[PDB]
Design an enzyme around this catalytic site. Structure first.
Site, mmCIF file in Angstrom:
data_model
loop_
_atom_site.group_PDB
_atom_site.id
_atom_site.type_symbol
_atom_site.label_atom_id
_atom_site.label_comp_id
_atom_site.label_asym_id
_atom_site.label_seq_id
_atom_site.Cartn_x
_atom_site.Cartn_y
_atom_site.Cartn_z
ATOM 1 C CG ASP A 26 -1.869 1.153 1.270
ATOM 2 O OD1 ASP A 26 -2.067 1.700 2.375
ATOM 3 O OD2 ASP A 26 -2.397 1.542 0.207
ATOM 4 C CG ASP B 289 -7.367 5.897 0.623
ATOM 5 O OD1 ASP B 289 -7.369 4.648 0.590
ATOM 6 O OD2 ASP B 289 -6.564 6.562 1.310
HETATM 7 O O1 LIG Z 1 -5.017 13.487 8.016
HETATM 8 C C1 LIG Z 1 -4.814 13.745 9.389
HETATM 9 C C2 LIG Z 1 -5.974 14.547 9.939
HETATM 10 O O2 LIG Z 1 -7.179 13.866 9.680
HETATM 11 C C3 LIG Z 1 -8.257 14.685 10.070
HETATM 12 O O3 LIG Z 1 -9.189 13.827 9.396
HETATM 13 C C4 LIG Z 1 -9.632 14.375 8.177
HETATM 14 C C5 LIG Z 1 -9.414 13.380 7.059
HETATM 15 O O4 LIG Z 1 -9.822 12.037 7.313
HETATM 16 C C6 LIG Z 1 -9.140 11.118 6.490
HETATM 17 C C7 LIG Z 1 -8.892 9.833 7.268
HETATM 18 O O5 LIG Z 1 -10.130 9.214 7.550
HETATM 19 C C8 LIG Z 1 -9.891 8.088 8.399
HETATM 20 O O6 LIG Z 1 -11.202 7.721 8.815
HETATM 21 C C9 LIG Z 1 -11.867 8.451 9.822
HETATM 22 C C10 LIG Z 1 -12.813 9.485 9.187
HETATM 23 O O7 LIG Z 1 -12.073 10.464 8.548
HETATM 24 C C11 LIG Z 1 -13.654 10.121 10.239
HETATM 25 O O8 LIG Z 1 -14.641 10.971 9.614
HETATM 26 C C12 LIG Z 1 -14.339 9.045 11.048
HETATM 27 O O9 LIG Z 1 -15.146 9.635 12.013
HETATM 28 O O10 LIG Z 1 -13.351 8.225 11.683
HETATM 29 C C13 LIG Z 1 -12.655 7.504 10.682
HETATM 30 C C14 LIG Z 1 -11.706 6.505 11.334
HETATM 31 O O11 LIG Z 1 -11.465 6.879 12.671
HETATM 32 C C15 LIG Z 1 -9.170 7.028 7.607
HETATM 33 O O12 LIG Z 1 -8.981 5.851 8.424
HETATM 34 C C16 LIG Z 1 -7.849 7.575 7.188
HETATM 35 O O13 LIG Z 1 -7.225 6.667 6.354
HETATM 36 C C17 LIG Z 1 -8.040 8.910 6.448
HETATM 37 O O14 LIG Z 1 -6.789 9.522 6.235
HETATM 38 C C18 LIG Z 1 -5.963 9.603 5.082
HETATM 39 O O15 LIG Z 1 -5.240 8.473 5.575
HETATM 40 C C19 LIG Z 1 -4.391 7.990 4.552
HETATM 41 C C20 LIG Z 1 -3.712 6.717 5.040
HETATM 42 O O16 LIG Z 1 -4.647 5.919 5.735
HETATM 43 C C21 LIG Z 1 -3.350 9.020 4.211
HETATM 44 O O17 LIG Z 1 -2.585 8.554 3.122
HETATM 45 C C22 LIG Z 1 -4.022 10.355 3.841
HETATM 46 O O18 LIG Z 1 -3.068 11.347 3.716
HETATM 47 C C23 LIG Z 1 -4.991 10.741 4.905
HETATM 48 O O19 LIG Z 1 -5.700 11.943 4.531
HETATM 49 O O20 LIG Z 1 -9.852 13.927 5.838
HETATM 50 C C24 LIG Z 1 -11.251 14.098 5.889
HETATM 51 C C25 LIG Z 1 -11.605 15.151 6.915
HETATM 52 O O21 LIG Z 1 -13.002 15.326 6.948
HETATM 53 C C26 LIG Z 1 -11.106 14.703 8.272
HETATM 54 O O22 LIG Z 1 -11.299 15.729 9.217
HETATM 55 C C27 LIG Z 1 -8.158 14.970 11.551
HETATM 56 O O23 LIG Z 1 -9.249 15.764 11.963
HETATM 57 C C28 LIG Z 1 -6.958 15.442 12.072
HETATM 58 O O24 LIG Z 1 -7.031 15.439 13.478
HETATM 59 C C29 LIG Z 1 -5.790 14.717 11.433
HETATM 60 O O25 LIG Z 1 -5.636 13.449 12.028
HETATM 61 O O1 LIG Z 2 -6.653 0.827 2.130
HETATM 62 C C1 LIG Z 2 -6.109 1.936 2.806
HETATM 63 C C2 LIG Z 2 -5.010 2.553 1.971
HETATM 64 O O2 LIG Z 2 -5.551 3.098 0.792
HETATM 65 C C3 LIG Z 2 -4.335 3.643 2.772
HETATM 66 O O3 LIG Z 2 -5.287 4.616 3.131
HETATM 67 O O4 LIG Z 2 -3.763 3.079 3.930
HETATM 68 C C4 LIG Z 2 -4.801 2.642 4.779
HETATM 69 C C5 LIG Z 2 -5.546 1.491 4.138
HETATM 70 O O5 LIG Z 2 -6.601 1.091 4.981
#
Ligand SMILES: OC[C@H]1O[C@@H](O[C@H]2[C@@H](OC[C@H]3O[C@@H](O[C@H]4[C@H](O)[C@@H](O)[C@H](O)O[C@@H]4CO)[C@H](O)[C@@H](O)[C@@H]3O[C@@H]3O[C@H](CO)[C@@H](O)[C@H](O)[C@H]3O)OC[C@@H](O)[C@@H]2O)[C@H](O)[C@@H](O)[C@H]1O
Ligand SMILES: O[C@@H]1[C@@H](O)[C@@H](O)OC[C@H]1O
Ligand SMILES: *[C@@H]1O[C@H](CO)[C@@H](O[C@@H]2O[C@H](CO)[C@@H](O[C@@H]3O[C@H](CO[C@H]4O[C@H](CO[C@H]5O[C@H](CO)[C@@H](O)[C@H](O)[C@@H]5O[C@H]5O[C@H](CO)[C@@H](O)[C@H](O)[C@@H]5O)[C@@H](O)[C@H](O[C@H]5O[C@H](CO)[C@@H](O)[C@H](O)[C@@H]5O)[C@@H]4O)[C@@H](O)[C@H](O[C@H]4O[C@H](CO)[C@@H](O)[C@H](O)[C@@H]4O[C@H]4O[C@H](CO)[C@@H](O)[C@H](O)[C@@H]4O[C@H]4O[C@H](CO)[C@@H](O)[C@H](O)[C@@H]4O)[C@@H]3O)[C@H](O)[C@H]2NC(C)=O)[C@H](O)[C@H]1NC(C)=O
Ligand SMILES: *[C@@H]1O[C@H](CO)[C@@H](O[C@@H]2O[C@H](CO)[C@@H](O[C@@H]3O[C@H](CO[C@H]4O[C@H](CO[C@H]5O[C@H](CO)[C@@H](O)[C@H](O)[C@@H]5O[C@H]5O[C@H](CO)[C@@H](O)[C@H](O)[C@@H]5O)[C@@H](O)[C@H](O[C@H]5O[C@H](CO)[C@@H](O)[C@H](O)[C@@H]5O)[C@@H]4O)[C@@H](O)[C@H](O[C@H]4O[C@H](CO)[C@@H](O)[C@H](O)[C@@H]4O[C@H]4O[C@H](CO)[C@@H](O)[C@H](O)[C@@H]4O[C@H]4O[C@H](CO)[C@@H](O)[C@H](O)[C@@H]4O)[C@@H]3O)[C@H](O)[C@H]2NC(C)=O)[C@H](O)[C@H]1NC(C)=O
Ligand SMILES: *[C@@H]1O[C@H](CO)[C@@H](O[C@@H]2O[C@H](CO)[C@@H](O[C@@H]3O[C@H](CO[C@H]4O[C@H](CO[C@H]5O[C@H](CO)[C@@H](O)[C@H](O)[C@@H]5O)[C@@H](O)[C@H](O[C@H]5O[C@H](CO)[C@@H](O)[C@H](O)[C@@H]5O)[C@@H]4O)[C@@H](O)[C@H](O[C@H]4O[C@H](CO)[C@@H](O)[C@H](O)[C@@H]4O[C@H]4O[C@H](CO)[C@@H](O)[C@H](O)[C@@H]4O[C@H]4O[C@H](CO)[C@@H](O)[C@H](O)[C@@H]4O)[C@@H]3O)[C@H](O)[C@H]2NC(C)=O)[C@H](O)[C@H]1NC(C)=O
Ligand SMILES: *[C@@H]1O[C@H](CO)[C@@H](O[C@@H]2O[C@H](CO)[C@@H](O[C@@H]3O[C@H](CO[C@H]4O[C@H](CO)[C@@H](O)[C@H](O)[C@@H]4O)[C@@H](O)[C@H](O[C@H]4O[C@H](CO)[C@@H](O)[C@H](O)[C@@H]4O[C@H]4O[C@H](CO)[C@@H](O)[C@H](O)[C@@H]4O)[C@@H]3O)[C@H](O)[C@H]2NC(C)=O)[C@H](O)[C@H]1NC(C)=O
Ligand SMILES: OC[C@H]1O[C@@H](O[C@H]2[C@H](O)[C@@H](O)[C@H](O[C@H]3[C@H](O)[C@@H](O)[C@H](O)O[C@@H]3CO)O[C@@H]2CO[C@H]2OC[C@@H](O)[C@H](O)[C@H]2O)[C@H](O)[C@@H](O)[C@@H]1O
Ligand SMILES: *[C@@H]1O[C@H](CO)[C@@H](O)[C@H](O)[C@H]1NC(C)=O
Ligand SMILES: *[C@@H]1O[C@H](CO)[C@@H](O)[C@H](O)[C@H]1NC(C)=O
Ligand SMILES: *[C@@H]1O[C@H](CO)[C@@H](O)[C@H](O)[C@H]1NC(C)=O
Ligand SMILES: *[C@@H]1O[C@H](CO)[C@@H](O)[C@H](O)[C@H]1NC(C)=O
Ligand SMILES: *[C@@H]1O[C@H](CO)[C@@H](O)[C@H](O)[C@H]1NC(C)=O
EC number: 3.2.1.177
Lengths: 718, 240
Positions: free
Chosen positions: A395, A487
């Site tokens: 990944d 994603d």
């Molecule tokens: O990026 C760091 C930043 O995130 C802030 O979150 C914003 C962001 O969310 C993306 C993130 O979502 C996770 O899932 C969350 C979900 O976003 C929430 O709404 C929900 O309530 O909870 C779930 C899980 O707890 C995914 O698990 C993450 O994968 C995803 O993040 C991306 O992650 C990938 C690798 O996994 C990375 O490559 C990316 O760069 C990264 O963006 O974007 C959407 C906004 O609405 C969110 O606010 C957060 O607030 C902040 O504290 C900080 O942690």
């Molecule tokens: O599938 C996801 C990948 O795309 C990245 O976000 O790393 C976290 C994994 O869950």
């Protein structure tokens, strides 16, 4: 009775630039051009020499038969494609290239020529930005306003006709630009270049660019119009014929973000066993390691992984897959060795860090370095492969930064939005600008070499294990590796756009393609998005999970939210979406295994001829249905959201909520006196060439089939 | 009775840069270094392999006997010249180069080492000015205030001691800068590079630069002091 060529190649000396045009495979020409300095010979190429299948007995190399300065026009023919060197303007010379196809009726059709009207820039433009001899290249070819472009990799654009689009060749999450495309004029084109650049599919000009290179290289292959299966046969013979997948990978793949410790994984297998629900592979996501670069499960949460994999196989028979990222941090136990042996890429000034994650700034390992590929497999085989986890999830290996189109990953969205320039890092094979597109391809190659080494098997033969990759490049189908769309947000509009992305991947040559059932990310503007306890998302997931049954690989995954939690994260199991939905989800799991003969049969034809698995409608009904030609040019929902899954099934997912009727366009097949389309759920037959509204309750996904159902379930369809 | 070497070469993996030191001709070492990408093999060289005259039977090429990451010091001897890989600062390692001559009276004399005092720039400095992989190089070697430099090509400067002079490697009428020089310490040095650059014969540091290249390449040969006819015998055996 193949029209074999009478010349091994033509070498033109046009001022300081040399152009070497050679016949290459069936109905193909290979063109290479360079100014002043000859090719080093160590350039990275993604095509086979000789092609996997063609008229040749041995490799071409740099061989040619005729040398000229391009003062006079010449002609060379190989198969049904003809090259004609001409002048520019009203002149009579031979330094400009033009390509024709010999049709069945004896006439010829201009596929494309070098874009050189009277007033225009040079169709082979060279520019030297640095003090050295490396150059940037801009090659221009003519195009017509009516042309249609299919392929170009994957992208969330909701289009299968890429005409009028500019595609930047820089990788990031869900975006794999690959310069391999088919045109409806009856030809395919491969820009055999690892450099970052640009794809311009303009109204009157097609242009490819290379940021930094020492040699331009492309291949053009012709086919009779409407005959796209031959184009894919030629592309796969040039860039790679896929292997046959292991039988277990065709089943149900359970995954989520994330199974956090060993006991949670063991209870998951116990649940499938106690409920008698079949599962073929269990996936462990990221953040399961102690440090970035350790490439091993954290023993504090995975104390005995050989026992975990054996227990999972004892309860369900399923294989296991684990995740790894290319990032390395200083706290890693391998950081000192990776740094000392030069196995890490680095930004070209400063400390050398390439991105950030987990609160630490990191460096990506160098997948282009053969020694680094060996170092990483020595870790994976020690801690995973020799312990029952023999499938790998590679990944976030897009290259350059850490998987995203922004720097400073893992930090706040405000910081991520600050326009820090994407890094032109140093690799062992070049820089990010000159060879960057190779990084995910070489990352797949790292595990392919490890797989084939452990099993004492040659590449291209039957696979015992697979890898799950989010990126790739030209000829990535040659690996025991499947691509997934990255994603995505868990909303209705996303489900509709994923279809066109997989159809574009098919035209690029990638058959092993899949998605995350139900989306991955929560959409913050949609209150119910990703919530497995709300009826709104339960509807979306069941529609989405049903579609994955009719995809090259059926796999569920995502980062869900919920109102009630009993683990590290919210659940994503077939029994986690309400009691009423459990029988619906399990039915499609059983249907997936019931289609095993059909799946293994169509995967085998993709292995032999490059026969596309999931098929856009133009590949089977452009010759027949006259209305399909326009439905593709306009990117109608009937062509961007419907497809042929194998030769017999026609699939069209429901992409809207609260729906009991769905309008499906049944294409014409060529026999108006019959009714060839049989609806799967009612067994009712319909005539081709019309839009029909079929019953689509939540448990039924609109699917028609040609021929009898019992024959397609038998596999004998080719 | 020539003190033939016991190793065909040493290849050091120092981070992303590779240094290949090989015995070359009588009382000579050849050093090549490159970051990240290996040599194309089509680089332009002005020295003979094998030298026109030397202990060798066949060409060296890229051949070597020992591979290390430079964690520990090593020693290699060919003729009367000795190589000693060392650390930087008070460290004990083997990624820095130093060259000695074995005198007739048994003692040794330091010809030169890589200019790396505690606070100083890296003696093998790489810089990428363009979008590609070609780089500029700045290699620094130690020097003493009393040293004398002879050669460096032709120039209308009215001097035979070039110490304290900077010689730009750009050709024009009556000015043929050529990085081949003899030192009165009893050694000669060849900067086997076709790139334009700079010759710095400073009080405490000798520095050669290359504007654009894919590989750094130099040869150092030792001779007993006052014996300049042997130095010219070795230079001609290397270059023609
Ligand atoms: O990026 C760091 C930043 O995130 C802030 O979150 C914003 C962001 O969310 C993306 C993130 O979502 C996770 O899932 C969350 C979900 O976003 C929430 O709404 C929900 O309530 O909870 C779930 C899980 O707890 C995914 O698990 C993450 O994968 C995803 O993040 C991306 O992650 C990938 C690798 O996994 C990375 O490559 C990316 O760069 C990264 O963006 O974007 C959407 C906004 O609405 C969110 O606010 C957060 O607030 C902040 O504290 C900080 O942690
Ligand atoms: O599938 C996801 C990948 O795309 C990245 O976000 O790393 C976290 C994994 O869950
Ligand atoms: C309303 O708006 C509309 C736009 O929205 C507008 O439409 C535009 O109309 C114009 C004119 O009608 C169109 O322009 C023409 O385009 C043609 C196609 O151009 C492409 O392909 C050619 C190659 O074509 C060969 O092969 C194909 C298929 O096999 C054949 O069909 C062709 O006939 C041709 O075949 C010959 O050569 C082959 C190879 O040698 C042989 O095998 C074969 O036997 C034939 O001999 C390419 O060359 C073109 O490339 C050029 O342009 C591209 C892109 O700009 C550049 O990248 C590239 O470098 C080139 O510059 C292109 O890709 C052209 O063929 C056609 O050319 C003729 O006229 C122009 C003047 O306008 C001349 O300059 C040119 O030399 C051509 O002239 C010859 O033929 C004409 C008549 O056919 C003769 O009158 C003339 O004497 C000359 O004769 C020559 O050949 C004769 C053949 O026997 C020979 O007898 C003579 O001795 C002599 O040698 C022209 O440019 C344009 O495409 C339309 N655009 C669109 C979108 O549709 C419309 O007009 C508007 N309507 C109104 C009322 O306003
Ligand atoms: C008036 O003004 C004057 C200036 O105008 C001023 O003169 C300056 O004075 C200072 C001090 O007097 C001088 O500094 C010294 O320079 C020496 C030479 O440096 C060069 O060469 C060495 C290599 O030398 C080896 O080989 C030669 C020849 O064979 C021998 O002669 C040497 O002894 C030495 O031999 C050893 O190692 C060999 C290889 O392993 C062995 O084969 C051999 O057996 C020996 O063991 C290079 O290493 C130097 O390179 C360094 O600097 C260059 C350029 O900056 C860098 O490019 C490079 O990266 C390096 O950093 C250099 O090229 C130095 O040897 C000498 O070093 C000693 O003291 C310093 C502290 O100042 C220590 O840090 C250093 O470690 C040395 O210490 C050891 O020895 C001292 C005493 O000798 C001990 O006290 C100490 O404990 C230590 O012991 C070590 O070795 C012992 C040997 O047995 C061992 O017993 C111990 O266990 C321990 O391991 C120092 O730097 C300077 O050159 C003068 N400048 C000029 C222009 O003259 C003058 O002082 C002023 N007067 C007044 C009153 O103010
Ligand atoms: C960057 O990334 C890195 C990783 O890449 C991130 O690091 C990780 O972060 C995650 C979470 O963010 C961590 O998961 C937590 O780990 C802790 C620690 O677990 C370990 O240590 C425990 C105790 O250790 C101590 O004692 C031992 C004695 O030997 C001693 O050696 C040691 O020095 C120390 O003093 C061990 O007991 C524990 O082992 C146990 O479980 C193992 C699993 O199978 C098993 O192998 C062992 O045999 C043993 O049984 C382990 O080694 C976990 O405690 C934590 O789990 C809790 O919280 C999660 C939610 O996060 C929850 O799901 C779990 O159920 C658990 O919750 C209990 O306590 C809660 C109080 O907070 C309570 O609310 C819960 O209800 C629950 O408790 C009670 O009731 C329930 C049911 O009613 C019952 O099940 C319970 O038993 C209990 O009675 C997480 O797993 C990673 O460990 C961590 N990784 C690393 C390398 O650090 C990092 O955060 C990132 N950094 C940045 C900046 O982003
Ligand atoms: C390795 O992996 C395993 C498997 O995941 C893991 O085991 C489990 O950990 C999870 C999470 O810690 C546990 O889930 C919790 O259990 C507690 C207590 O559960 C007991 O009592 C109930 C009563 O019916 C029984 O059904 C059950 O069997 C248990 O005996 C629950 O309280 C937890 O739930 C709450 O918080 C959630 C948010 O985190 C809420 O979403 C949820 O609604 C619960 O909250 C609200 O509940 C009440 C509201 O009416 C009220 O009390 C409060 O308002 C409260 O907020 C959660 O379900 C799970 O039991 C563990 N499973 C096992 C077999 O042990 C290991 O811990 C892990 N090991 C590691 C990481 O080292
Ligand atoms: O429909 C337009 C409007 O919807 C808002 O959402 C409502 C839903 O319509 C409603 O079904 C939902 O119901 C929940 C209930 O809240 C919960 O107790 C129960 O257990 O589950 C039901 C179904 O899942 O409530 C939401 C409201 O959501 C939140 O935001 C508003 C705030 O007042 C609430 O406290 C929150 O729960 C959307 O919020 C709004 O944008 C739409 O325009
Ligand atoms: C080969 O055939 C082409 C026609 O396509 C002709 O122009 C050329 O002269 C021929 N060359 C030879 C050696 O026969
Ligand atoms: C797996 O091993 C268990 C004992 O742990 C045994 O009861 C069961 O029959 C075995 N099943 C298979 C499929 O081998
Ligand atoms: C694979 O590589 C290993 C070293 O990693 C080597 O020993 C072996 O010969 C190779 N081939 C096979 C079939 O294992
Ligand atoms: C449709 O036919 C199949 C057999 O081909 C059968 O299993 C299924 O029940 C039928 N569906 C009906 C009658 O609705
Ligand atoms: C060769 O001689 C050197 C001493 O100059 C010694 O350090 C080295 O270990 C020797 N190597 C072998 C193989 O004898």
């Amino acid at each position: 009775t193949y029209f074999a060529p009478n010349s091994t190649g033509l070498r033109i000396q046009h001022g300081f630039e040399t152009i070497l045009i050679q016949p290459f495979g069936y109905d193909g020409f290979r063109v290479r051009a360079w100014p002043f300095r000859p090719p080093s010979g160590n350039e990275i190429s993604f095509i086979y020499d000789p092609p996997i299948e063609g008229y040749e007995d041995t490799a071409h190399g740099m061989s040619y038969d005729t040398a000229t300065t391009g003062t006079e026009p010449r002609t060379l023919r190989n198969g049904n494609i003809i090259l004609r060197t001409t002048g520019w303007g009203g002149t009579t010379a031979g330094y400009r290239l033009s390509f024709y196809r010999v049709n069945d009726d004896g006439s010829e059709t201009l596929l494309t020529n070098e874009y050189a009207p009277l007033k225009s820039l040079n169709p082979r433009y060279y520019y030297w930005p640095g003090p050295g001899a490396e150059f940037s290249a801009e090659f221009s070819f003519s195009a017509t306003p009516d042309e249609q472009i299919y392929g170009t990799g994957t992208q969330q654009d909701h289009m299968i006709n890429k005409k009028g689009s500019v595609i930047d060749m820089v990788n990031f999450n869900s975006y794999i630009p690959t310069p391999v495309f088919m045109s409806n004029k009856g030809y395919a084109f491969i820009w055999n270049m690892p450099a970052e650049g640009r794809m311009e599919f303009g109204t009157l000009r097609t242009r490819f660019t290379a940021a930094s290179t020492t040699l331009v290289d492309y291949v053009i292959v012709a086919a009779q119009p409407g005959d796209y299966d031959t184009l894919q046969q030629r592309i796969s013979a040039l860039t790679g014929r896929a292997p046959a997948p292991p039988d277990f990978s065709l089943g149900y793949i359970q995954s989520k973000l994330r199974y956090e410790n060993q006991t949670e994984v063991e209870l998951l297998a116990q649940n499938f066993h106690d409920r008698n629900i079949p599962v073929s592979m269990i996936v462990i996501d990221y953040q399961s390691w102690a440090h970035q670069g350790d490439w091993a499960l954290d023993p504090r949460l995975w104390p005995n992984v050989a026992q975990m994999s054996a227990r999972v196989k004892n309860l369900t028979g399923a294989e296991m897959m684990a995740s790894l990222w290319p990032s390395v941090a200083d706290d890693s136990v391998n950081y000192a060795a990776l740094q000392a042996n030069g196995l890490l890429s680095a930004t070209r000034d400063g400390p050398g860090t390439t991105d950030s994650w987990n609160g630490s700034y990191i460096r990506n390992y160098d997948s282009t370095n053969p020694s680094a590929r060996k170092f990483l497999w020595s870790m994976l085989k020690k801690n995973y492969y020799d312990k029952g986890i023999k499938n790998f999830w590679i990944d976030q290996a897009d290259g350059g930064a850490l998987g995203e189109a922004y720097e400073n990953n893992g930090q706040s969205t405000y910081i991520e939005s600050i326009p820090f320039t994407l890094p032109n890092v140093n690799y062992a094979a070049g820089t990010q600008l000159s060879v960057g597109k190779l990084y995910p391809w070489a990352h797949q190659q790292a595990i392919e070499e490890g797989f084939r080494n452990a099993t004492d098997t040659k590449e291209g033969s039957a696979c015992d294990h697979v890898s799950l990759s989010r990126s790739g490049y030209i000829g990535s189908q040659r690996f025991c590796s499947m691509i997934w769309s990255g994603d995505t947000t868990s909303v209705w509009d996303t489900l509709a756009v994923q279809v066109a992305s997989g159809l574009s991947a098919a035209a690029t040559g990638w058959g092993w393609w899949t998605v995350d059932a139900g989306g991955f990310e929560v959409d913050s503007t949609v209150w119910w998005s990703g919530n497995i306890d709300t009826p709104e998302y339960r509807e979306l997931y069941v529609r989405w999970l049903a579609w994955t049954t009719f995809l090259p690989f059926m796999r569920t995954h995502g980062s869900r939210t919920c109102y009630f939690q009993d683990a590290y994260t919210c659940a994503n199991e077939p029994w986690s979406y309400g009691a009423s939905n459990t029988p619906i989800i399990v039915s499609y799991i059983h249907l997936r295994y019931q289609l095993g003969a059909y799946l293994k049969s169509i995967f085998n034809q993709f292995h032999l001829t490059g026969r596309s698995i999931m098929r856009p409608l133009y590949m089977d009904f452009e010759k027949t249905d006259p209305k399909i030609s326009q439905l593709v040019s306009s990117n109608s929902n009937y062509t961007t959201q419907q497809y042929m899954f194998g030769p017999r099934l026609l699939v069209s997912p429901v992409t809207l909520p609260n729906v009991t009727e769905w309008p499906v366009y049944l294409p014409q097949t060529g026999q108006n006196n019959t009714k060839p389309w049989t609806y799967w759920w009612t067994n009712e037959t319909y005539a081709g060439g019309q839009v029909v509204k079929v019953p689509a309750p939540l448990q039924h996904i609109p699917v028609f089939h040609l021929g009898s159902r019992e024959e397609l379930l038998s596999g004998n369809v080719f």
